[PDB]
Design a binder for these strands. Structure first.
Ligand SMILES: [Mn+2]
Length: 1498
RNA sequence: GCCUAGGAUCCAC
RNA sequence: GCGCACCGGGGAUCCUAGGC
């Protein structure tokens, strides 16, 4: 099902023929195996001659450790003017490098009424009851202050104060004097305006009105105020005088916005040792308060707190937000003034001092250190323990430890971007160090453009550590030190994957995308859907030029790192592929056959175009773009730049003129100014259905509308809470909507609207209400509509793959979506299909270091790309060598690399530079128009090649969309530079390219060139080309020398193992081996494969897709996995976060990470949950695992281990029964009596009957009472919206099958959302309700027979006697009989894994201690279904679920038992875990920890 | 400019 | 003390009516 082009018209006229005849000009794909050898010998002779003479550069250098170390030392010798640094001096100046670091190592160190009043007012404000219009927060602060006054007069509860400021309702920290003066002014002005009443009276009345309105609104939605233990006695008849006469003396908090001198730090600088963990604990608390600084709602402000430019100097705190955090003997307040995630200025303040240190920061970057105060210490301890027995270093081990700790603390404190590329490039350095040859242009690629002082200090520390490890007299254990330095390098993963700045990264990415095209020689700009003849001529010219490359037979010789491919070498490659020369013997037998003889359902944000007429828009509108740019600069100046400058400034007057235009003459700017004026005037004149505002047409009480909006924004429509509104309001709203003919016909079907009609007529008032909401839900004065303008300038629109795919499927009525459909093309042209030329859209992934760009096309583009991808994949599958998809080939490559390193043979661990942009679809078209697969069959191969040619032709003429952000930024920069503001006179090539089109009209929207291959688009075609070219290169090398090479590659990589011949050659004659490597480089360049300067040749290591291998030992990437586990949390249900962390940690332990650290990672995750006020269930995580629990067991085995650890002596009498039960089920006794009489029956009364059915003693009466609290027992928790989702008690297995058959937030924002959910009515009642977790805790504490129990790790489980099992069935419904769930899971694993798990576990205690070195590994294999196997076996035990859930989503003798044993489980994934996530089959563990893992004998 | 009544904004994005 | 494509981020009030 590939060839389907015969349904369309060809229309290939005089252009496709030209491109075809281009790649047949000077190419001879018929050379025999002898002419090819002769030409290769000639080329090699000429190359060796011209390399000895010196007409060609060296390009490779033999490794000299001394020279490499010297270059790394003098890598940054223009600012770091030094060579050797004293370790003590480095330590000394580390603890003073920055505010955060100064604070980390400094020498520092009641149930009152104010808390009640503050919580009450916070709840009142959260509901958005009272419209803040005239200093409402002022009387809020007045109430809080009165509460505090009464409180202190009672017993002097000196909390909630900061010397002279107190914490207000939301989070605000207001000063006493300022609010006192404000109350004075307000009472005075009010008394004057209303003038008889005393000031005390006029204040108490103002308090009473607000309190009365708040209490009345609260006693309307069942939030009765008696819950909050408030006391309205605090409103004393003598209060105003009590306030004005109250005064607390202390300090005044401050925030410093400028770089303060290093003497105002009120504590001793360095007292904390690096060995201790107190610095990590301080960083943990500070990072926690910094992430919490994002949960503050953006309330209005009372006072301006400063005036004029002094508002960016040292600023006193009269009204600012404040987050508290404690340090082990004291408390501190992180004070700030802005709310959100954007970068802002914080300041730490104490109670006995003020403004300890202020610093700018970005809150959503400090997550990796939240509770990892003991994980990181153990990481450093293990890394030090690696190189600990090296006798050349034992004299100065403490310095190595100090440097490692300092590097970690530093990268955690300041997670800057360019402080990550340094630690990344350290890997390439240490790789080239131990090798034998490397690229001469290496050091010029390790240099990162460092900026701040902290980055230079980090470089200094790294340099000291390197020169301490890789010395010239430490030739003891190179493998351990290599692994140590590699892990130090991989420490870069501890920073973040995110981007510090969106626009700057998206512009650097566009510069990377645009520069090579401009430097190549030609670029088409703003192409039309019907390509112009000149554009076709330029494409043909660029085509004929792309083959014009030459080298080593010319005057100038070769020119390296320039895109293109020589006709001679392309002809050699095609001929050698047609002569069977590039065919191993295991492939000439099975002759190569041409491959001509829901699926996209994802969340890739596929693109979709806009249509203004019959044609679609392909160019931004110049006038609209400049209008939007000016509209942006207006908000930038008014909202922000107002309190920044004076008014006599030229730039200020120009910006204010532009603002008045939206809301000089002697420089040539008045002309352009009036042009912009008339343009924006035309735009404003040109800019002069159901929705949310329809709620205004229905609900009279605006407060109810505010509640509805708050719900809709906090939670999705589906989990809308019932008790947020009065019951009668639902029916009233439904009636009022249905009566309004307009809204009735806009939301109901009188002929989803059908569902609204049904639910209304059925009197399902809440259902009708939620349906209506779902249909609906889907500052400065502007003289026009700003949002429609902003959304009209854009050209493309993103969405989900599934949405557009379903729309296309509905419009059809894989290949069925692009050829047989109502919106199908008729006559594909030369450029592209009849629909129009292919179109992509630039993006970029978030990758450590640099960021690769991802192309995104619309549906037709994705389909036509997938056709070529599948064709070339099925083609490459016949040939051996590629490892992009074939996992078996990758494992073979790993085995070959291991064998090669074991023999100390030469290994070339290559990599290619700019593989994406340099490759081009024309190259693939040329290399495809010359191969012949089927030597005999020459009938259908021609048709297949013609089809693939006509597809690659379209892919050649593709047009890439320039992102809207970068074009807007360039337009604003152009406007500014036209005004003359900030003349730079540099004008990088990108800016020149943009301006050259801006100042002549048209704006660059779509760019098309012959040069770029979509990075990640043709990922398999490029892989096939790389395979077929590397095979020819190795064939040439074998033809010249007398050795062989075995190469593996996945589309950008190369691991080339050399035979013994090449190794002994490099041993004897270094010159010949070097010129061979150089000729290999030359060849790879001649075929458009530019070897990257990050490639090495050595006999010590071998990397492939970041999988290093040394002799004997194996190198784990400890810090990589630890950093991947530290920040890997989301805003999801806790039993899913736990499963994700468990999978991550399993993958980790399968790669050499010790378990003593994985336990600490799990403890950190549990602490992160405990902080969010969530109870810990036994089915969450087992933080006491061993080695066996990851190699033998699986997800559900460590759970059994944990439960056994919780309740010993009770699970034993259950395994005793389970052994006999498994024996009976395996011999084939019943196999159905159990699966029906006990799996579809009661729980405990059935459990005792089941265990007495066999010949074992039933459990004691005081064992069935052990139960665990299962929140979400009726319905899963309602999660607060952190991502817009694109468009009964269902068992978890059913939802897993649904997921398989078919814009999120950052990590820190996700953790904030998680902490916001748990504590905001997340649980759901039996039928439909909402309760706080604390309310359920209270309801459980009421019953004086329920006993809680907690383990040392903090796992909760309860003891509920049997007499309480009834009567009060409102809460007991949430408990589950732990023992029975343990039995169920144990049985579900005993038939998943072997029957061993039912044995009696015993710890190996007869084993004495061995002298365990921290580096000696042990390889192990795990102790060893499908999708339709489950779905064809589920309609037998629960056919109603099929008829209800799984039907529209379209034999094993024991799967029918397991697939039902997990349905009634509803406690943990049992078969879902093996159907959704594949277990790894190769583990590398510590041979010392295996000595302590338990034994589970049958 | 100030005061009063009402309307708008008052998780993160 | 953030970002560091030299361009960004770093303090929230607004509207209608009436009275002085
Ligand atoms: Mn590689």
């Amino acid at each position: 099902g590939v060839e389907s082009l015969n349904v369309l018209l060809d229309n290939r006229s005089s252009h496709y023929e030209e491109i075809i005849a281009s790649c047949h000009q000077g190419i001879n794909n018929k050379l025999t195996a002898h002419e090819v050898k002769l030409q290769i010998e000639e080329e090699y002779q000429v190359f060796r001659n011209r390399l000895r003479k010196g007409e060609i550069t060296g390009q490779f250098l033999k490794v000299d450790k001394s020279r490499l170390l010297n270059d790394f030392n003098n890598l940054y010798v223009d600012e770091v003017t030094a060579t050797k640094d004293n370790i003590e001096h480095l330590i000394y100046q580390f603890k003073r490098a920055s505010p955060i670091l100064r604070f980390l190592y400094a020498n520092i160190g009641k149930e009152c009424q104010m808390q009640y009043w503050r919580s009450f007012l916070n709840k009142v404000k959260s509901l958005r009851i009272l419209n803040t219009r005239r200093k409402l927060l002022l009387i809020f602060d007045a109430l809080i202050l009165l509460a505090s006054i009464h409180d202190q007069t009672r017993h002097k509860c000196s909390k909630g104060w900061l010397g002279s400021c107190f914490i207000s309702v939301n989070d605000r920290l207001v000063s006493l004097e300022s609010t006192k003066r404000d109350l004075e002014k307000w009472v005075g002005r009010r008394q004057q305006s209303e003038r008889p009443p005393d000031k005390n009276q006029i204040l108490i009345s103002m308090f009473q009105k607000t309190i009365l309105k708040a209490t009345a609104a609260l006693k309307d939605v069942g939030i009765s105020v008696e819950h909050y233990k408030i006391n309205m006695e605090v409103i004393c008849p003598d209060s105003y005088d009590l306030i004005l006469n109250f005064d607390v003396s202390g300090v005044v908090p401050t925030i410093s916005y400028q770089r303060t001198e290093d003497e105002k730090f009120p504590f001793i600088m360095g007292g904390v040792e690096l060995l201790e963990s107190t610095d990590l604990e301080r960083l943990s608390s500070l990072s926690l308060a910094l992430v919490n600084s994002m949960k503050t709602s953006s309330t209005v402000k009372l006072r301006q707190n400063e005036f004029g430019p002094a508002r960016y100097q040292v600023v006193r705190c009269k009204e600012a937000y404040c987050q508290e955090f404690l340090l082990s003997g004291a408390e501190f307040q992180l004070i700030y003034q802005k709310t959100g995630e954007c970068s802002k200025c914080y300041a730490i303040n104490d109670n006995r001092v003020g403004e300890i240190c202020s610093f700018y920061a970005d809150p959503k970057r400090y997550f990796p250190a939240i509770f990892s105060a003991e994980v990181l210490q153990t990481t450093v301890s293990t890394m030090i323990s690696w190189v600990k027995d090296c006798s050349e270093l034992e004299e100065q081990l403490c310095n190595i430890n100090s440097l490692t700790k300092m590097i970690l603390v530093l990268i955690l404190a300041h997670p800057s971007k360019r402080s990550q590329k340094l630690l990344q490039n350290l890997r390439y350095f240490i790789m080239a160090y131990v090798s034998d040859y490397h690229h001469k242009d290496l050091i010029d690629k390790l240099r990162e453009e460092l900026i701040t002082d902290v980055e230079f200090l980090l470089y200094r520390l790294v340099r000291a550590l390197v020169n301490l490890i890789l010395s010239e007299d430490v030739k003891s254990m190179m493998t351990n030190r290599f692994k140590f330095i590699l892990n130090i390098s991989y420490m870069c993963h501890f920073i973040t994957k995110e981007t510090p700045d969106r626009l700057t990264d998206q512009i650097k990415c566009f510069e990377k995308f645009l520069e090579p095209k401009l430097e190549f020689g030609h670029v088409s700009i703003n192409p039309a859907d019907v390509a112009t003849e000149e554009e076709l001529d330029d494409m043909v010219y660029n085509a004929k030029k792309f083959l014009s490359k030459e080298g080593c037979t010319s005057i100038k010789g070769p020119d390296y790192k320039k895109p293109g491919v020589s006709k001679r070498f392309l002809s050699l490659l095609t001929s050698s592929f047609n002569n069977g020369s590039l065919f191993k013997e295991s492939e000439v037998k099975r002759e190569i056959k041409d491959p001509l003889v829901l699926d996209l359902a994802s969340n890739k944000s596929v693109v979709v175009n806009k249509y203004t007429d019959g044609s679609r828009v392909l160019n931004y509108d110049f006038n609209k773009l400049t209008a939007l740019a000016v509209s942006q600069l207006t908000e930038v100046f008014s909202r922000k730049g107002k309190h920044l400058l004076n008014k006599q400034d030229y730039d200020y007057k120009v910006q204010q003129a532009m603002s008045n235009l939206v809301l000089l003459l002697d420089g040539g700017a008045s002309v352009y100014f009036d042009q912009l004026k008339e343009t924006v005037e035309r735009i404003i004149d040109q800019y002069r259905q159901p929705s949310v505002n329809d709620l205004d047409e229905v609900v009279p009480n605006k407060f109810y509308i505010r509640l509805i909006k708050g719900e809709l924004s906090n939670h999705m429509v589906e989990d809308f809470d019932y008790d947020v509104l009065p019951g009668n309001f639902y029916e009233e709203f439904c009636d009022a909507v249905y009566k309004n003919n307009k809204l009735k016909e806009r939301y109901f079907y009188c002929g989803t609207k059908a569902v609204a009609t049904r639910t209304y007529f059925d009197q399902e008032y809440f259902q009708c209400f939620k349906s209506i909401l779902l249909i609906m839900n889907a500052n400065l004065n502007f003289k026009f509509d700003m949002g429609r303008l902003s959304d009209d300038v854009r050209i493309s629109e993103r969405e989900s793959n599934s949405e557009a795919l379903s729309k296309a499927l509905s419009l059809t009525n894989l290949k069925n979506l692009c050829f047989y459909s109502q919106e199908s093309p008729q006559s594909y042209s030369s450029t592209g299909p009849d629909t129009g030329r292919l179109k992509f859209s630039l993006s970029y992934k978030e990758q450590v270091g640099g960021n690769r760009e991802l192309y995104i096309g619309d549906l037709r583009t994705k389909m036509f790309t997938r056709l070529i991808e599948d064709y070339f994949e099925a083609l490459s599958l016949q040939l051996s060598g590629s490892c992009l998809n074939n996992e078996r080939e990758f494992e073979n490559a790993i085995l070959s690399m291991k064998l090669n390193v074991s023999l100390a043979h030469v290994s070339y661990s290559m990599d290619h530079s700019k593989w994406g942009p340099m490759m081009c679809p024309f190259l693939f078209l040329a290399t495809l128009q010359n191969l012949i697969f089927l030597s005999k069959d020459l009938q259908a191969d021609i048709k297949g090649r013609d089809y693939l040619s006509t597809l690659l032709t379209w892919h050649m003429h593709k047009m890439v969309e320039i992102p809207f952000n970068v074009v807007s930024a360039m337009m604003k920069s152009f406007i500014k530079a036209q005004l003359g503001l900030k003349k730079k006179t540099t004008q990088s090539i990108t800016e020149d390219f943009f301006y050259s089109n801006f100042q002549i009209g048209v704006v660059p929207s779509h760019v098309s060139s012959i040069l770029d291959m979509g990075q990640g688009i043709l990922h398999n075609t490029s892989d096939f080309y790389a395979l077929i070219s590397e095979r020819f290169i190795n064939y040439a090398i074998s033809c010249i020398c007398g050795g062989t090479i075995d190469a593996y590659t996945s589309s950008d990589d190369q691991i080339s193992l050399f035979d013994q011949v090449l190794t002994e050659l490099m041993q004897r004659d270094p010159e010949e081996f070097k010129t061979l490597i150089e000729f290999h480089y030359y060849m790879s360049d001649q075929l458009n494969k530019f070897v990257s300067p990050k490639s090495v040749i050595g006999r010590f290591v071998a990397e492939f897709k970041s999988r290093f291998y040394v002799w004997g030992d194996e190198v784990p990437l400890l810090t990589k996995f630890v950093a991947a586990a530290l920040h890997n949390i989301k805003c999801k249900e806790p039993h899913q976060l736990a499963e994700t962390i468990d999978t991550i940690i399993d993958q980790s332990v399968a790669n050499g990470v010790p378990v003593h650290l994985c336990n600490l990672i799990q403890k950190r995750t549990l602490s992160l949950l405990q902080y969010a006020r969530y109870p810990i269930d036994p089915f969450l995580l087992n933080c006491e695992t061993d080695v066996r629990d990851w190699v033998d067991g699986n997800r559900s085995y460590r759970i059994m281990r944990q439960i056994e650890r919780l309740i010993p002596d009770a699970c034993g009498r259950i395994r005793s029964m389970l052994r006999k039960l498994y024996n009976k089920l395996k011999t084939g006794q019943l196999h159905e009596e159990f699966t029906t009489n006990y799996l579809s029956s009661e729980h405990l009364s059935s459990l005792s009957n089941l265990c007495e059915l066999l010949g074992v003693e039933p459990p004691s009466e005081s064992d069935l009472e052990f139960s665990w609290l299962n929140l979400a027992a009726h319905h899963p928790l309602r999660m607060v919206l952190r991502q817009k989702i694109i468009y009964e008690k269902v068992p978890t297995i059913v939802k897993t099958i649904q997921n398989k058959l078919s814009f999120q937030s950052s990590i820190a924002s996700g953790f904030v959302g998680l902490c916001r959910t748990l504590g905001s009515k997340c649980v759901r009642g039996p039928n439909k309700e909402s309760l706080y977790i604390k309310s359920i805790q209270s309801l459980i504490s009421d019953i004086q027979g329920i006993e809680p129990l907690i383990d040392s790790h903090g796992v909760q489980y309860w003891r509920v006697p049997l007499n309480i099992r009834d009567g009060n069935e409102g809460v007991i419904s949430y408990f589950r009989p732990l023992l029975w769930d343990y039995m169920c899971i144990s049985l579900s694993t005993a038939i998943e894994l072997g029957a061993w798990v039912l044995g009696e576990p015993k710890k190996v205690r007869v084993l004495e201690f061995f002298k365990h070195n921290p580096c000696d590994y042990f390889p192990l294999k795990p102790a060893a279904v499908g999708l339709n196997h489950i779905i064809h076996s589920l309609r037998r035990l629960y056919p109603s679920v099929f008829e209800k859930h799984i039907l529209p989503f379209m034999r094993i003798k024991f799967l029918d038992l397991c697939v039902a044993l997990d349905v009634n489980c509803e406690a943990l994934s049992l078969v879902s875990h093996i159907v959704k996530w594949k277990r790894e089959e190769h583990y590398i563990v510590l041979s010392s920890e295996l000595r302590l893992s338990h034994t589970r004998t049958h």
